[PDB]
Amino acid sequence: QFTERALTILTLAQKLASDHQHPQLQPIHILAAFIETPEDGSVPYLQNLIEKGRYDYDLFKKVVNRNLVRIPQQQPAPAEITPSYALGKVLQDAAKIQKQQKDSFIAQDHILFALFNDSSIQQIFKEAQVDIEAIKQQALELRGNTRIDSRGADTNTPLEYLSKYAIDMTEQARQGKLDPVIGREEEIRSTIRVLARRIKSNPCLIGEPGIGKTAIIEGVAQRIIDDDVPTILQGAKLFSLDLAALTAGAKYKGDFEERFKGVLKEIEESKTLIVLFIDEIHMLMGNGKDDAANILKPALSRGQLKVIGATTNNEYRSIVEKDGAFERRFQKIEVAEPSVRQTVAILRGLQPKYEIHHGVRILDSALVTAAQLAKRYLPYRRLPDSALDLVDISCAGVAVARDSKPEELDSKERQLQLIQVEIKALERDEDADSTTKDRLKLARQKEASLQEELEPLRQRYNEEKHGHEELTQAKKKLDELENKALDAERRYDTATAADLRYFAIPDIKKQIEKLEDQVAEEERRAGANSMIQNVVDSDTISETAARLTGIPVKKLSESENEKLIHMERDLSSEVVGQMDAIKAVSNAVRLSRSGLANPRQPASFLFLGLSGSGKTELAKKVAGFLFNDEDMMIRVDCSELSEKYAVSKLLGTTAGYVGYDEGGFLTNQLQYKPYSVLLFDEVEKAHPDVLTVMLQMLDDGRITSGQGKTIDCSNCIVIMTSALGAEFINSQQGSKIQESTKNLVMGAVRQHFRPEFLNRISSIVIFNKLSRKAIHKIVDIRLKEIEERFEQNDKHYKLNLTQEAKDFLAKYGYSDDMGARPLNRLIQNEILNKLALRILKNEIKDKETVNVVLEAEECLEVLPN
Amino acid sequence: VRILDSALVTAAQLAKRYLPYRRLPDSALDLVDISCAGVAVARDSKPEELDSKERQLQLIQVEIKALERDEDADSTTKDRLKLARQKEASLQEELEPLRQRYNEEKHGHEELTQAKKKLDELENKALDAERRYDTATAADLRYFAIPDIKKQIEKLEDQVAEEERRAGANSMIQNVVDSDT
Amino acid sequence: QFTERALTILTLAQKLASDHQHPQLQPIHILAAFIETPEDGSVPYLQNLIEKGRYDYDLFKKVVNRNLVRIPQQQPAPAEITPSYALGKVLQDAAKIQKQQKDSFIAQDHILFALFNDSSIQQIFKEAQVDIEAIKQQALELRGNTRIDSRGADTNTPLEYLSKYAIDMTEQARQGK
Numbered sequence A: 001q002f003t004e005r006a007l008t009i010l011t012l013a014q015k016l017a018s019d020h021q022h023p024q025l026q027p028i029h030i031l032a033a034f035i036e037t038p039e040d041g042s043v044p045y046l047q048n049l050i051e052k053g054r055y056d057y058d059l060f061k062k063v064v065n066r067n068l069v070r071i072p073q074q075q076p077a078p079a080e081i082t083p084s085y086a087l088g089k090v091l092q093d094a095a096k097i098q099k100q101q102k103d104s105f106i107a108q109d110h111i112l113f114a115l116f117n118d119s120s121i122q123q124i125f126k127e128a129q130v131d132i133e134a135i136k137q138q139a140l141e142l143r144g145n146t147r148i149d150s151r152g153a154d155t156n157t158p159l160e161y162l163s164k165y166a167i168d169m170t171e172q173a174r175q176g177k178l179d180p181v182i183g184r185e186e187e188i189r190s191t192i193r194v195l196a197r198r199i200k201s202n203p204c205l206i207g208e209p210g211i212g213k214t215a216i217i218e219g220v221a222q223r224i225i226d227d228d229v230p231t232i233l234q235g236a237k238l239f240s241l242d243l244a245a246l247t248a249g250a251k252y253k254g255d256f257e258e259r260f261k262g263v264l265k266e267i268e269e270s271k272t273l274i275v276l277f278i279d280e281i282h283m284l285m286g287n288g289k290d291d292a293a294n295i296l297k298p299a300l301s302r303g304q305l306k307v308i309g310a311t312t313n314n315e316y317r318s319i320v321e322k323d324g325a326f327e328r329r330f331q332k333i334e335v336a337e338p339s340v341r342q343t344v345a346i347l348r349g350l351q352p353k354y355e356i357h358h359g360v361r362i363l364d365s366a367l368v369t370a371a372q373l374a375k376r377y378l379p380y381r382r383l384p385d386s387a388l389d390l391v392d393i394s395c396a397g398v399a400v401a402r403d404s405k406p407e408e409l410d411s412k413e414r415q416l417q418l419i420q421v422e423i424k425a426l427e428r429d430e431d432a433d434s435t436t437k438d439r440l441k442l443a444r445q446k447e448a449s450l451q452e453e454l455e456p457l458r459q460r461y462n463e464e465k466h467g468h469e470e471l472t473q474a475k476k477k478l479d480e481l482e483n484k485a486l487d488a489e490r491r492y493d494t495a496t497a498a499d500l501r502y503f504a505i506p507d508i509k510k511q512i513e514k515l516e517d518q519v520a521e522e523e524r525r526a527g528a529n530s531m532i533q534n535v536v537d538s539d540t541i542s543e544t545a546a547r548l549t550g551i552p553v554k555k556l557s558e559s560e561n562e563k564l565i566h567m568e569r570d571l572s573s574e575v576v577g578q579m580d581a582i583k584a585v586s587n588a589v590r591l592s593r594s595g596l597a598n599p600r601q602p603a604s605f606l607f608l609g610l611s612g613s614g615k616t617e618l619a620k621k622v623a624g625f626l627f628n629d630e631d632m633m634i635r636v637d638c639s640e641l642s643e644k645y646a647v648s649k650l651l652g653t654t655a656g657y658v659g660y661d662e663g664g665f666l667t668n669q670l671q672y673k674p675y676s677v678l679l680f681d682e683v684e685k686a687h688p689d690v691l692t693v694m695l696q697m698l699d700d701g702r703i704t705s706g707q708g709k710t711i712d713c714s715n716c717i718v719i720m721t722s723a724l725g726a727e728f729i730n731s732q733q734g735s736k737i738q739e740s741t742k743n744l745v746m747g748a749v750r751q752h753f754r755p756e757f758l759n760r761i762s763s764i765v766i767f768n769k770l771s772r773k774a775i776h777k778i779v780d781i782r783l784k785e786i787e788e789r790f791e792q793n794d795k796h797y798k799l800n801l802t803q804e805a806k807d808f809l810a811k812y813g814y815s816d817d818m819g820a821r822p823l824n825r826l827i828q829n830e831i832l833n834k835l836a837l838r839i840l841k842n843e844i845k846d847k848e849t850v851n852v853v854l855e856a857e858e859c860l861e862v863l864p865n
Numbered sequence B: 001v002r003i004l005d006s007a008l009v010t011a012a013q014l015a016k017r018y019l020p021y022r023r024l025p026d027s028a029l030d031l032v033d034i035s036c037a038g039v040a041v042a043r044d045s046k047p048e049e050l051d052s053k054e055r056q057l058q059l060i061q062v063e064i065k066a067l068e069r070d071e072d073a074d075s076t077t078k079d080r081l082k083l084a085r086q087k088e089a090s091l092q093e094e095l096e097p098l099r100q101r102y103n104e105e106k107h108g109h110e111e112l113t114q115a116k117k118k119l120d121e122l123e124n125k126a127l128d129a130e131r132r133y134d135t136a137t138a139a140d141l142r143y144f145a146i147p148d149i150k151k152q153i154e155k156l157e158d159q160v161a162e163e164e165r166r167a168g169a170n171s172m173i174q175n176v177v178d179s180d181t
Numbered sequence C: 001q002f003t004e005r006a007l008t009i010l011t012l013a014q015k016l017a018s019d020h021q022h023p024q025l026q027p028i029h030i031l032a033a034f035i036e037t038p039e040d041g042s043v044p045y046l047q048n049l050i051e052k053g054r055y056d057y058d059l060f061k062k063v064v065n066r067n068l069v070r071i072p073q074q075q076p077a078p079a080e081i082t083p084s085y086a087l088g089k090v091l092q093d094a095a096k097i098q099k100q101q102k103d104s105f106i107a108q109d110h111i112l113f114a115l116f117n118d119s120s121i122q123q124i125f126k127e128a129q130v131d132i133e134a135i136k137q138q139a140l141e142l143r144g145n146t147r148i149d150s151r152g153a154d155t156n157t158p159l160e161y162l163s164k165y166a167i168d169m170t171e172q173a174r175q176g177k
Ligand SMILES: Nc1ncnc2c1ncn2[C@@H]1O[C@H](COP(=O)(O)OP(=O)(O)OP(O)(O)=S)[C@@H](O)[C@H]1O
Pocket: A179, A180, A181, A182, A183, A184, A206, A207, A208, A209, A210, A211, A212, A213, A214, A216, A345, A346, A349, A382, A384, A385, A388
């Protein structure tokens, strides 16, 4: 549909040879070559879409003779063009594809006969094929092109199912329109190398989901179109479909796979540059595995036609076992996840690319670093491409900023334009002249200069975008043009490229060089006008958070370290009482996100507590430490058991038992919180082999799943502890420290109850008895804390305080079990009880702020107001 | 390619050793495979020296004209246009036949390799004519000769194996690469 | 050709002869002139020939077009209509003007490709339909590679353009609807 693509017959008419007898001009169009020999391995040879029941048996001599049998020339260009009956018919030679049943000039096998127009006769006496009319039967095979433009004719490939075959995006690589997203390569190169492997072959992989390393693989494979590779794989290539031939790609089954299966038999035949895109045998097989046009190939693997495919993570295992004989013919490797700098390279790589769309620079550095965060913020999604998601979310946040315009006036449209509404809104009411109620005109005096600046402001992105248009366009089109240089540079072709490429590099780039330098800011922001438009990553990043959990600004705040580095001494503030644990923990803490010793290993404390006491407190505090997250909640139970753990273990079973969660219960959690800490008590009571199930949970607390998953840790953490003590727990005398007593229960219980496991394991920690003073103030701390969360404001105030009940509260404060942690209720109720009455009456929604006068207690509370 | 035995063997050993759970052939078969693997792109022609020295073109290529018109000192533009094209013309040359005569003789390998490829095929087929009974047993089997057909072989790529470029003959190295691979 | 759906605009030929029948009528007229619309015909009111379709703006060709086929000789209900000399009139002219549109079969607007030497009531630029630029050219100008599955709007290229049942947006509340 453009040029040079093909002429099925017509390309062989005068072009089967250059100049010998001057055959290019004769009555038939068959001259330079006639259909090769009497079959189509060439232009319309023998039986073809010319027709099945109508074809030229002697037409080779018949069409090619009137075509050429050439000494009708007088030179190698014996005539202007190659004029003849069919030759001068070249008006209708292209017309061979012109009317119904033919395509454009011609195409496929329909490229063969019809473009020839007159041959064997003009049309007089013979049975030879057909084009747009006589091909009505053959229009299935030699016809069916339906796309005459942008793609090379090349081999016959008549009929077939070509789009809905599959896709070689090497044509989009011809387009280039894909994304040269690179750097994890050797594996491919290996794989590539591994693709060449005889005996068995066809490696297939995968780690993280979904966006198709294939083209990625094709990328170098296009570079192998550029021929990275020895001839074979160099002479192999591939076409992408798995689905689309799916249940729409046929009415119902049975050609469905088959047409394909037949189509296999096309490609199989001395046809280089043929390899088979698959994604997922996952997608294949099934419940009631379909044989999915597939197992047959493991036979038919026999001849030729290697392939590609992808192989998930756990399920790849769930594949692996189905058949190894199946396996036995297709090679298998798998994939790793990049990150950070790896990603940075992408992060590096990409910034143009959706600038190449959305057209926004940012400093982007922190923005990069936002990823890992944002990564760590919703990392279940595929880290880079989720990080890629940010790249959107970025430009999202930008397009946010953008809307119409970037964000200044479309904002200021709130004023300047609504002040330009003030310019003409009131233009006519009852009367507007000089002194009247009609306020219209005055806005026109001011906003002009303002609304003028809109115009640069408009330009500032626009005229920059104007420039930036080309900017994106510039190397883009070089990436066309230097690919159009690269058009053939990989054949050891050179100057055809360099020809246009001469100065084209140092002009575009010079324009770039010219235009890139161009700023026209006052100096507004940086080297530009509106490009970052005024767009701050952090804030988008914030907006990211402001999409994602929000709760920002500490998430603006990160020196995880420094933040922490006080936070101990700070959360000390948060601390209820006993300090060194923190201090201990703090070490571990700092040590923790420090790591720097083991990638694997988290840390746990003996953290010997009292009910609720700090015990819970730790958790939330701890929980409150990492981030605000209260979500972080994790714990166990089935310490009660003998043989149970299924949900309680992770793995459950394989599929086929209660829930397919298989600890997904704990694991979706495990999924949904890379980073946490665990306790569960009864750990004292804990089922021992469960502790052997705990065992691994440790360094090497890495997951196993009923699907075969694996975690790592120190990601999350644990301090799972108990009380289990009494003599110390009850020790009364002594609170902090006191004696090596501490050791006794401590020394014992573990070594008493528990093995060298522990000796591996981390840390050993305790509570301390309570100090009515140290106790005391903790009182309002919660109660202080109370009014706080209240989402409303009137009263919202201090009230009682002093000591009056505090001590009643203390007298009701810690009791040798708790009489402490519960008090909240036991407190609040009273409190609730009180305010209820008042929140009933609410004598003033402000004022309030009293303290209590108050049975044999000489107590029992309430309050005046 | 060529092959050094003992490696393969010894390969198999710890192949087996280092990877038991591929069965006694298999692991080797994998070596056997993977041999060809590390071989494989190693049989890409000069993959580094493919793209490496090729650049000398593109380095000086565009400037063959892009200097022809350029804003520089007058006629020194053409000088740098000339003097690098000089080194583009010249420096190309030292490898310019040279890279082929690798690949040439590599082909000469792959040539003879195809005779290596060839011989057996026939020899197979030659010995399938034993299924032609004793009629075509030795008849064809004589026609295939081999006094020389291998005297061809290991005396042919002999030289280019014999000839070391500087050393090691082919950077193709194509042979067993003892562990390495 | 024209199409499988040619019934409608193609139905008006015997309808043109509907006064009394015809031994045949002629490809000088048909209700496809009016098509489905009571002014200029879909195309030569809007669809194809609205803007550029030359003659028969609204009532131009169709208003008086019926003079040819009106009334029978003796026809209680013997016969209706037939192209006769027009039979092959668009025959090649139906499948010629398509070229390659990314399409399937013969076109009535493809039959609208070349119009006719003279079959019509109108003088514009020729004895052919409307005036000039319409049909295959107008359609090709106005559209391409799209008609209908096996068929389409009766006689004429086709008023059908957008996806049958649309539920408006732009113009939906453009009126505040
Ligand atoms: N090396 C790379 N450099 C830059 N971007 C990359 C790179 N590899 C992948 N990407 C991006 O990630 C997507 C590529 O699809 P992939 O996801 O990498 O293929 P894949 O086989 O599905 O890997 P998964 O399974 O989707 S995570 C595209 O959006 C690319 O922009």
